Scaffold this active site. Structure first.
Site, PDB file in Angstrom:
ATOM      1  N   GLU A 142      91.461 -19.615 -31.620  1.00  0.00           N
ATOM      2  CA  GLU A 142      91.424 -19.925 -30.158  1.00  0.00           C
ATOM      3  C   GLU A 142      92.161 -18.827 -29.486  1.00  0.00           C
ATOM      4  O   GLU A 142      93.335 -18.837 -29.563  1.00  0.00           O
ATOM      5  CB  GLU A 142      92.027 -21.338 -29.803  1.00  0.00           C
ATOM      6  N   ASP A 150      95.288 -22.374 -32.614  1.00  0.00           N
ATOM      7  CA  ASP A 150      95.516 -22.635 -31.228  1.00  0.00           C
ATOM      8  C   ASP A 150      96.249 -21.570 -30.471  1.00  0.00           C
ATOM      9  O   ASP A 150      97.404 -21.114 -31.000  1.00  0.00           O
ATOM     10  CB  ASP A 150      96.388 -24.153 -31.278  1.00  0.00           C
TER      11      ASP A 150
HETATM   12  C1  LIG Z   1      95.325 -25.169 -22.628  1.00  0.00           C
HETATM   13  C2  LIG Z   1      94.831 -23.968 -22.739  1.00  0.00           C
HETATM   14  O1  LIG Z   1      95.230 -22.960 -21.846  1.00  0.00           O
HETATM   15  C3  LIG Z   1      94.983 -21.738 -21.792  1.00  0.00           C
HETATM   16  O2  LIG Z   1      93.594 -21.378 -21.483  1.00  0.00           O
HETATM   17  C4  LIG Z   1      93.147 -21.797 -20.219  1.00  0.00           C
HETATM   18  C5  LIG Z   1      93.227 -20.476 -19.343  1.00  0.00           C
HETATM   19  O3  LIG Z   1      94.697 -19.868 -19.267  1.00  0.00           O
HETATM   20  C6  LIG Z   1      93.023 -21.054 -17.763  1.00  0.00           C
HETATM   21  O4  LIG Z   1      93.135 -19.709 -17.104  1.00  0.00           O
HETATM   22  C7  LIG Z   1      91.605 -21.549 -17.702  1.00  0.00           C
HETATM   23  O5  LIG Z   1      90.527 -20.330 -18.027  1.00  0.00           O
HETATM   24  C8  LIG Z   1      89.419 -20.656 -17.352  1.00  0.00           C
HETATM   25  C9  LIG Z   1      89.489 -19.433 -15.846  1.00  0.00           C
HETATM   26  O6  LIG Z   1      90.691 -19.795 -15.172  1.00  0.00           O
HETATM   27  C10 LIG Z   1      88.516 -19.431 -15.355  1.00  0.00           C
HETATM   28  O7  LIG Z   1      88.105 -18.213 -14.513  1.00  0.00           O
HETATM   29  C11 LIG Z   1      87.107 -19.314 -16.256  1.00  0.00           C
HETATM   30  O8  LIG Z   1      85.815 -19.338 -15.455  1.00  0.00           O
HETATM   31  O9  LIG Z   1      87.086 -20.245 -17.102  1.00  0.00           O
HETATM   32  C12 LIG Z   1      88.171 -20.188 -17.947  1.00  0.00           C
HETATM   33  C13 LIG Z   1      88.025 -21.654 -19.135  1.00  0.00           C
HETATM   34  O10 LIG Z   1      87.993 -22.759 -18.411  1.00  0.00           O
HETATM   35  O11 LIG Z   1      91.691 -22.410 -18.574  1.00  0.00           O
HETATM   36  C14 LIG Z   1      91.877 -22.185 -20.146  1.00  0.00           C
HETATM   37  C15 LIG Z   1      91.509 -23.345 -21.011  1.00  0.00           C
HETATM   38  O12 LIG Z   1      90.057 -23.964 -20.746  1.00  0.00           O
HETATM   39  C16 LIG Z   1      95.289 -20.849 -23.271  1.00  0.00           C
HETATM   40  O13 LIG Z   1      94.673 -19.589 -23.546  1.00  0.00           O
HETATM   41  C17 LIG Z   1      94.869 -21.887 -24.215  1.00  0.00           C
HETATM   42  O14 LIG Z   1      95.317 -21.380 -25.356  1.00  0.00           O
HETATM   43  C18 LIG Z   1      94.972 -23.420 -24.255  1.00  0.00           C
HETATM   44  N1  LIG Z   1      94.430 -24.453 -25.188  1.00  0.00           N
HETATM   45  C19 LIG Z   1      95.313 -24.787 -26.326  1.00  0.00           C
HETATM   46  C20 LIG Z   1      96.967 -24.798 -26.195  1.00  0.00           C
HETATM   47  C21 LIG Z   1      97.451 -25.916 -25.933  1.00  0.00           C
HETATM   48  C22 LIG Z   1      99.110 -25.630 -26.246  1.00  0.00           C
HETATM   49  O15 LIG Z   1      99.284 -26.040 -27.413  1.00  0.00           O
HETATM   50  C23 LIG Z   1      96.931 -27.309 -25.645  1.00  0.00           C
HETATM   51  O16 LIG Z   1      97.300 -27.874 -24.314  1.00  0.00           O
HETATM   52  C24 LIG Z   1      95.304 -27.248 -25.620  1.00  0.00           C
HETATM   53  O17 LIG Z   1      94.894 -28.392 -25.514  1.00  0.00           O
HETATM   54  C25 LIG Z   1      94.815 -26.138 -26.550  1.00  0.00           C
HETATM   55  O18 LIG Z   1      93.464 -26.431 -27.032  1.00  0.00           O
END
Ligand SMILES: C[C@H]1O[C@H](O[C@H]2[C@H](O)[C@@H](O)[C@@H](O[C@H]3[C@H](O)[C@@H](O)[C@H](O)O[C@@H]3CO)O[C@@H]2CO)[C@H](O)[C@@H](O)[C@@H]1N[C@H]1C=C(CO)[C@@H](O)[C@H](O)[C@H]1O
Ligand SMILES: C[C@H]1O[C@H](O[C@H]2[C@H](O)[C@@H](O)[C@@H](O[C@H]3[C@H](O)[C@@H](O)[C@H](O)O[C@@H]3CO)O[C@@H]2CO)[C@H](O)[C@@H](O)[C@@H]1N[C@H]1C=C(CO)[C@@H](O)[C@H](O)[C@H]1O
Ligand SMILES: [Ca+2]
Ligand SMILES: [Ca+2]
Ligand SMILES: [Mg+2]
Ligand SMILES: [Mg+2]
Ligand SMILES: [Mg+2]
Ligand SMILES: [Mg+2]
Lengths: 569, 570
Positions: A285, A210
């Site tokens: 990830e 993660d």
């Molecule tokens: C929850 C997750 O958060 C982080 O990843 C996020 C991005 O930081 C965020 O910008 C967004 O990315 C999107 C972007 O904004 C958009 O322009 C593009 O088209 O699509 C992107 C993806 O949708 O959302 C993502 C997540 O989808 C971190 O980088 C990840 O590490 C994190 N996932 C982990 C971590 C945690 C904390 O332990 C949990 O809450 C999560 O469930 C786990 O999988």
């Protein structure tokens, strides 16, 4: 006579299924998915043609971030079951030939962990386990305390939380309750080896790692004994407490994080050498730009990292707005940038993003499952994609996602909430869709479960699931395990993907990703001699499996996808 | 065995197009200014180089504020360059040599010294609405405090609106204050553009390069409650209200209506070619835009047809010395992935608005870049100097003449804006001013390196950039390059391949190490390549010479080293 192929290590061409245990199967009537529920349905993965399952976190957790806030990395969350239930799951999965990966959350621990309680108390050996900082000297208002720097949490607001007890700030890149480890502490790096060794010795086949971009932040030693501010973005829609207000230069993708990943892979390689049996693996990830993503595999100096970093391109860069040329150009990015020898992987969904057919369209499910299965390397399936589950509706009242609860109100919550992709799995058309014997599920069961459910799709002549099964089965063919690939758009609407391998059958995807009909000249498709036979079709294709393509002119409907089986090259 | 016939393409679908910058090509008369007689005297250079087609930067009557992109009379030659008679002689001698000649057409804007503008400013009937004229924005906070119609920002710095004391209204300039935007919603303006093109086609021009097309049309006030709507702000805090970048050009660039004008120009040009016969006359459009907006210049879903092609600026905008071989592959694939089926691909490595190709990349990558340009499918575009690896010339604040630098620049920053380094006189030889002129007073200083980098030196020495260039334009006559498929992939972060193949015809393979480090690659990974293969062209620094036999499947390439291999037919 067809050429012989050298068998690949299991992880190089596995179908990997991501279970969200809280929403897979409730065995005990509390409306909460659990390990006995997973055990009861391990046969599903075999029936599906899944090779490996990865569960979201199942370790002891106050559940603030539904498992990503871990209070004991060495035991099982009581709501999902016991250590005994976990060992049963590994035994029965292994007996069925399945690999089982756990979700390893190295960036942070729950503030209810013994690590944090002891660190907050400055216990010897735990004092420097997390990132602790004095306030920023305020000469102007010595009266008002200043955070160490302007760093912003992913879940809203300051990444710095005041501890009354320790009279210092701790770093949290995620929820206040998710405390970041100090990855410059050798005792921390040793604990991460201890945790992984513990679960490998239990019999796990590897880990999904993660949030790795966030492991390491600027050393205040390098900025005259302060934590340096992140640069400002300028985006006038974001104030100093809102994610997007800063550019994470000092808090994300630091080159020092990759040394930790390479040290993990060295540990894992030594573990595998000393234990034999199936290779144990780590899949990372990391949402990052291409350059920083590829560094997970390894670097130009011969360092080796994750078996692969996840490829989030179908989440981040493609959607219902994408045309066929977009599909081709994004598919080509991983295949163009991935280092030589790297195993490609394709991810259409996860528990943090909207469901595949919601991001795309309902009429595109088969086409997207075919892309996943027919591209070279590793297919990743998120719980529900095999039957085309859609985002469920979740009211503000039913919303439990900490990110929504921190960054939203009842007007905005839906912009932040990951809950709609976390609704319970549709087994059948019984109470709570066969997920639970109870009507009170931890998130509401999506309204369409009478229409979209596994048992319906096994009964009916044509279904997402039957297409999924035909595709996982096709992956046994030498053409998909060892075949070359060619991919180009025929129009704004339709592209081909061709897998070819001398002396073995040719397989071709044709996919109209648009909302309009399209007619294409199959004469333009390399390695496609006609007649060819439909192996798979979209559930609403005029063509059935077994149907013969004889004409070089092909009209595809909106969303229509075909796999053709053609004579070897 | 026996090589298939290929159907020969129309000239424009695989031409080598050379962009002449007249002011810096050849000075025939000692004024330190390149001229039409200069061009005529070296038209043999294009035949020598294997160039099919020349396009000249503007040579029409111009006060030269933007060195000819500020046109005061669209129907006659700029006096410093020569006379109409010199232009007619250029067309006649270029055509005798089998060359096609295109003119730079500048439809967005006219000089403020044009008859069009003087008559428009004076409200002469038929000219009143030739340009975008607007009243000041009503100011309810303090009535009669003069506000511009909108926040729109010029490409050369400051407001895009200039006050006329005479007309008591603002006029629009997307470029210099002296470059006045035509109203493309006035049928009289649209008629005048056909009149200009008809004039120069009648002289025998083989077509046009169309300037600045993204800027043709701006938001209609009738759609914004009778005002010019502000462009959205950017936020980027390095940019104040008078600085380019302060706005996002939503209402001032890439409006869908502009493409309707382009398609009407193509419709006129098809009608002209149909009625006059002879060689197809073509339009090639200049548009820095995103991929969607770029590809609409070719045509649209409704079946409308636009420019023969829009220029592909990807080797200027998206690749540089910071690019690895995976960047090279991924950017080359963008045009080929996004271009409509039937479209002709094209490749631009430089122009008079950008740093020279060897300066953007490195001096040891020149031959590799020219091979890319010549070996990719479709049209090769060469900017004056690239055939001899000309580097950017040093140009002091004191010698700087580019209006963009004079408006946006100061002594310490001028280098950020000035296009002058890429406009320094062409290096013919090692005589005074590199044989560009008999005078040492040249309109821009001759680059310091002309002793080392000049055409004549390169024609005499055994291995050179120009000799490689000749070998590559000669190769484009081969069926494999005109009609062959392509295959491109990176073998490493350092080296990529490009394979042109066509059953029963020879296979050609580029291998290019774009890095600063030696790379070893396995040629077994390269499709359609059977060894032994023959080096057809090598980088001037390569240990391999043309005629060298590649026998080993293991190949070490030095930093910047490129080879074209000739391999048996598939
Ligand atoms: C929850 C997750 O958060 C982080 O990843 C996020 C991005 O930081 C965020 O910008 C967004 O990315 C999107 C972007 O904004 C958009 O322009 C593009 O088209 O699509 C992107 C993806 O949708 O959302 C993502 C997540 O989808 C971190 O980088 C990840 O590490 C994190 N996932 C982990 C971590 C945690 C904390 O332990 C949990 O809450 C999560 O469930 C786990 O999988
Ligand atoms: C002079 C030229 O100006 C405009 O094109 C500019 C872009 O607006 C400017 O942003 C810049 O683009 C670079 C981009 O900033 C950078 O990040 C990317 O990596 O590289 C891009 C290319 O360097 O530079 C380009 C110019 O290279 C217009 O879009 C053009 O129409 C315009 N050229 C025409 C127009 C005029 C006016 O008649 C002449 O001055 C010019 O000589 C002529 O060719
Ligand atoms: Ca961290
Ligand atoms: Ca205009
Ligand atoms: Mg339960
Ligand atoms: Mg002269
Ligand atoms: Mg510039
Ligand atoms: Mg091929």
């Amino acid at each position: 006579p067809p050429t012989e192929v050298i068998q690949l290590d299991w992880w190089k061409n596995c179908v990997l299924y991501q279970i969200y245990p809280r929403s897979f199967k409730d065995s005990d009537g509390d409306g909460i998915g659990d390990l006995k529920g997973i055990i009861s349905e391990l046969k599903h993965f075999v029936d599906a043609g899944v090779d490996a399952i990865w569960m979201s976190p199942i370790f002891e957790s106050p559940m603030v971030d539904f498992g990503y806030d871990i209070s004991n990395f060495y035991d099982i969350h009581y709501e999902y079951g016991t250590m005994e239930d976990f060992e049963e799951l590994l035994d029965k999965a292994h007996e069925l030939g399945l690999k089982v990966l756990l979700d390893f959350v190295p960036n942070h621990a729950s503030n209810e962990s013994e690590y944090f309680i002891k660190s907050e108390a400055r216990e010897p050996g735990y004092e420097n386990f997390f990132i602790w900082a004095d306030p920023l000297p305020n000469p102007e208002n010595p009266g008002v305390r200043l955070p160490p720097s302007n760093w912003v949490s992913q879940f809203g607001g300051s990444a710095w939380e005041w501890s009354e007890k320790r009279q210092q700030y701790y770093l949290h890149q995620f929820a206040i309750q998710q405390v970041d480890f100090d990855f410059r502490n050798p005792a921390v790096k040793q604990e991460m080896f201890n945790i992984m060794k513990f679960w490998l010795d239990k019999g796990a086949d590897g880990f999904r790692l993660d949030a790795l971009p966030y492991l390491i932040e600027a050393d205040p030693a390098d900025h005259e004994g302060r934590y340096p501010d992140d640069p400002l973005s300028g985006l006038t829609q974001f104030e100093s407490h809102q994610l997007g207000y800063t550019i994470p230069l000092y808090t994300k993708d630091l080159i020092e994080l990759y040394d930790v990943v390479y040290e993990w892979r060295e540990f894992l390689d030594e573990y595998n050498k000393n234990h034999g049996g199936d290779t144990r693996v780590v899949f990372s990830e990391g949402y990052a730009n291409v350059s920083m993503t590829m560094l997970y595999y390894g670097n130009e100096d011969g360092a080796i990292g994750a078996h692969f970093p996840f490829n989030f391109d179908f989440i981040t860069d493609l959607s219902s707005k994408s045309n066929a040329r977009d599909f081709v150009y994004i598919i080509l990015r991983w295949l163009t940038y991935m280092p030589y020898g790297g195993i490609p992987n394709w991810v259409f969904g996860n528990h943090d993003n909207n469901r595949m057919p919601t991001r795309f369209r309902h009429d595109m499910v088969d086409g997207l499952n075919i892309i996943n299965m027919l591209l070279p390397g590793v297919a990743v399936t998120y719980q529900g994609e095999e039957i085309g589950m859609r985002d469920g509706y979740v009211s503000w009242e039913d919303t439990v996602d900490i990110e929504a609860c921190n960054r939203g109100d009842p007007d905005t919550y839906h912009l932040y909430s990951r809950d709609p992709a976390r609704t319970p799995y549709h087994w059948d058309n019984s109470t709570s869709a066969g997920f639970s014997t109870s009507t009170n599920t931890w998130l509401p069961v999506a309204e369409d479960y009478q229409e979209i459910n596994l048992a319906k799709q096994k009964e009916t002549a044509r279904s997402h699931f039957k297409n999924y099964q035909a595709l996982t089965k096709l992956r046994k063919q030498a053409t998909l395990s060892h075949g070359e690939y060619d991919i180009r758009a025929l129009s704004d609407r339709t592209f081909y993907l061709v897998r070819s391998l001398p002396t073995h059958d040719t397989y071709v995807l044709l996919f109209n990703v648009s909302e309009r009909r399209d007619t294409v000249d199959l004469g333009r498709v390399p390695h496609l001699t006609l007649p060819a036979t439909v192996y798979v079709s979209s559930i609403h294709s005029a063509r059935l499996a077994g149907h013969e393509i004889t004409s070089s002119q092909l009209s595809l409907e909106a969303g229509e996808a075909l796999v053709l089986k053609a004579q070897p090259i």
